[PDB]
Design an enzyme around this catalytic site. Structure first.
Site, PDB file in Angstrom:
ATOM      1  N   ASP A 183      30.392 -20.147 -57.474  1.00  0.00           N
ATOM      2  CA  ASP A 183      31.242 -18.993 -57.542  1.00  0.00           C
ATOM      3  C   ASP A 183      31.015 -18.174 -56.263  1.00  0.00           C
ATOM      4  O   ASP A 183      29.957 -18.206 -55.673  1.00  0.00           O
ATOM      5  CB  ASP A 183      30.922 -18.198 -58.800  1.00  0.00           C
ATOM      6  CG  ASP A 183      31.598 -16.825 -58.834  1.00  0.00           C
ATOM      7  OD1 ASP A 183      32.851 -16.735 -58.781  1.00  0.00           O
ATOM      8  OD2 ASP A 183      30.832 -15.841 -58.938  1.00  0.00           O
ATOM      9  N   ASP A 185      32.142 -14.407 -55.646  1.00  0.00           N
ATOM     10  CA  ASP A 185      31.841 -12.965 -55.807  1.00  0.00           C
ATOM     11  C   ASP A 185      30.560 -12.749 -56.612  1.00  0.00           C
ATOM     12  O   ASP A 185      30.485 -13.124 -57.790  1.00  0.00           O
ATOM     13  CB  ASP A 185      33.009 -12.210 -56.423  1.00  0.00           C
ATOM     14  CG  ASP A 185      34.297 -12.379 -55.622  1.00  0.00           C
ATOM     15  OD1 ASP A 185      34.656 -11.495 -54.845  1.00  0.00           O
ATOM     16  OD2 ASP A 185      34.954 -13.419 -55.749  1.00  0.00           O
TER      17      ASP A 185
HETATM   18 CL   LIG Z   1      35.762 -15.487 -59.786  1.00  0.00          CL
HETATM   19 MG   LIG Z   2      31.148 -13.879 -59.654  1.00  0.00          MG
END
Ligand SMILES: [Cl-]
Ligand SMILES: [Mg+2]
Ligand SMILES: [Cl-]
Ligand SMILES: [Mg+2]
EC number: 3.1.3.3
Lengths: 396, 396
Positions: A183, A185
């Protein structure tokens, strides 16, 4: 040679013990079945299982020759007929990683107690890091069917004692991991891009509140993505490039990716964020795969919509499968790392799902959880040591 | 916590020592820097480096609590201020594999002597197999620049003592091997296909003599291939399928390939033999790559020629490079296994070149040499143990 004899040397370590023992044994009719040696904090253990004729194992020559040579130089030795002793130890079933800053003796003690309470034998302990966190590996033999209760017990120890504790399969297959996705962020990249986009619109607080709601698993990801992107309607598209220029990698991210390249991992990112931001970075980090959403632009201005299909919770897992199939990697040899409830399906489909400084919703179902703000602690969970990282980096 | 203390427990192994020590330490203000434990032949060593306030490391409480608890149950303990002691041991530079049937104490003793003679510290010894051959690993720390002289010395020990001895790089990169190629004839497959083809023509003796010449490096591979294939002029092409049906895998070949698939290796064969024979088998073994020569056929009859380009010595290396590039694998992470002088360029270009029951011409320049007729001993050189193979096979 008919019979088996076991020779066990212990004491304060000195140079040349190993050569001396075998040279002594070579005067008797001896063939080797197993040798185990290590020195820990200047303490030597050298265990040698040999076979020789009943002839030689029953006569006093072999004993006196070995006892005299080992005791002259100040170490202890034992010799004994074996016959029923195991030739070669079994492999460990599992390995347990404990990371902390600090690791209290109370915490490590609590790990050893739950392990013992479940009938789990500790086969070996060693250090895997002194930086950025203290890291310790226990290779273990777990009775069949106990491995669920062991993670459960060690998850409680982890939250009560302020250490990360990951239990993993240590068999040949399960541990040749070959593909990883991150992922973006708050995993690979510090903070939330959609919040950085919203501050340009004077909307950070509204967007931040909805993001935290959605990452804790309280809101439908898609509805939350649409309400948040809506907040950006009317920003000029130049904002994308500005926010891309402001992005900071999670501390340890570069060491993580560079180490994973050395190991031959295929490397990818699966995001609910925006491709025009992520590609810039993914090309720079030489990643092999990107899945992301896409902002709608009309006349150089954001409309506040995304151009579907929306990468949602199910979508992240779907993306990992797509990447694993293109790369030729079975799902059991894939790894995924995320922080948000957004990532739950991806982490569950991966061979190993790692929650990195994660909301409780993800932490609760993740194979392993990391609580310290160093993305390189992921490398320790992949069986790499800090010393191994540093050596390989120092060669260039 | 200001200062460092080292606690070293040794003695006859008992359940619950580990939990007991840490529970004792938890009553004093102790944080862990490093833990190393192993049990060898029922001998325990548990070395624990901790930090605590100068306050606690200088007062008699910590000592008496630890000494009393460890001695009550019958083990020995040492405690001492450290401060200048290493937190965590360095990685080994290299690892040495010794395989034999038998491994005499004299042979293993000769290995330890050359190691010591070159300033090389033995960091750890363990067993890696009891079947089909006894196998032993020594992880070592080699002074820079000594690694050439070490292989040289251990090659002499290997030929004089009747053991295989392979010295390999044990750094992170060098040891994430991810691609392997095999020669076919007398490597993956028992015997020489071109000899099996010649027996159909009544020419086995002529072809066998030229093959042995060419595999020892006495004849130009291409000229030798043409003289041998010439011998088959006029055989009906049905002979190809008959000889394919007669082929027998090298003992251990199936375990080798199946284990390499579990590890995610890309797997291939590079042969000077014939594609119509090799493809049949390569599809069956689910290999990812075949390079081979091609027999010329007119009207269903072999002409005695091949259809160029001829895979020669340079050609085998060229094929490995082609495969490594298609697969995304740097040459340093490739492995090649062969027996004949035919294979010299391929073995030299590979990250690790393994000579399998090989003619002296190949053995002389190979990174490692195997002398026992079990192709699975290759797995031991790739860091796999017999117990690991057996566990993974027993799961299914
Ligand atoms: Cl995301
Ligand atoms: Mg995230
Ligand atoms: Cl060939
Ligand atoms: Mg051959």
């Amino acid at each position: 040679p008919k019979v088996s004899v076991l020779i066990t040397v212990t004491g304060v370590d000195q140079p040349g013990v190993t050569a001396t023992l075998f040279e002594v044994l070579s005067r008797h009719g001896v063939e080797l079945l197993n040798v185990e040696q290590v020195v820990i904090r200047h303490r030597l253990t050298l265990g040698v299982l040999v076979c020789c004729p009943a002839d030689v194992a029953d006569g006093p020559a072999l004993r006196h020759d070995v006892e005299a040579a080992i005791r002259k130089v100040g170490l202890d030795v034992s010799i004994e007929r074996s016959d029923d002793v195991p030739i070669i130890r079994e492999p460990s079933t599992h390995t347990i990683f404990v990371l902390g800053r600090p690791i209290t003796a109370a915490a490590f003690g609590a790990v050893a107690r739950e392990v013992a309470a479940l009938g789990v034998n500790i086969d070996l302990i060693r250090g895997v890091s002194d930086y950025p966190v203290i890291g310790l590996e226990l290779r273990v033999s777990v009775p069949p069917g106990a491995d669920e209760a062991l993670r459960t017990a060690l998850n409680r120890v982890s939250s009560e004692e302020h250490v990360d504790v990951a239990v993993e399969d240590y068999t040949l297959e399960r541990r040749a991991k070959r593909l990883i996705v991150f992922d973006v962020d708050s995993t690979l990249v510090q903070g939330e891009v959609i919040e950085m986009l919203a501050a340009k619109a004077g909307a950070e607080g509204q967007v931040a509140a909805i993001t935290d709601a959605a990452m804790r698993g309280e809101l439908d990801f898609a509805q939350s993505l649409q309400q948040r992107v809506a907040t950006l309607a009317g920003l000029p598209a130049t904002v994308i490039d500005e926010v891309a220029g402001q992005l900071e990698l999670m501390p340890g991210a570069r060491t993580t990716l560079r180490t994973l390249r050395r190991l031959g991992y295929a490397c990818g990112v699966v995001s609910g964020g925006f491709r025009r931001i992520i590609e810039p970075l993914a090309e720079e980090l030489m990643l092999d795969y990107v899945a992301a959403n896409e902002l709608e632009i009309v006349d150089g201005t954001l409309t506040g919509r995304v151009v579907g299909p929306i990468i949602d919770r199910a979508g992240k897992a779907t993306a990992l499968r797509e990447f694993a199939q293109r790369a030729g990697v079975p799902m059991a040899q894939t790894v995924a790392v995320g922080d948000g409830a957004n990532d739950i399906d991806m982490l569950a489909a991966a061979g190993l799902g790692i929650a990195f400084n994660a909301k409780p919703a993800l932490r609760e179902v993740a194979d392993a959880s990391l609580s310290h703000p160093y993305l390189d602690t992921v490398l320790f969970l992949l069986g790499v040591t800090r010393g191994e990282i540093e050596a390989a980096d120092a060669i260039d």
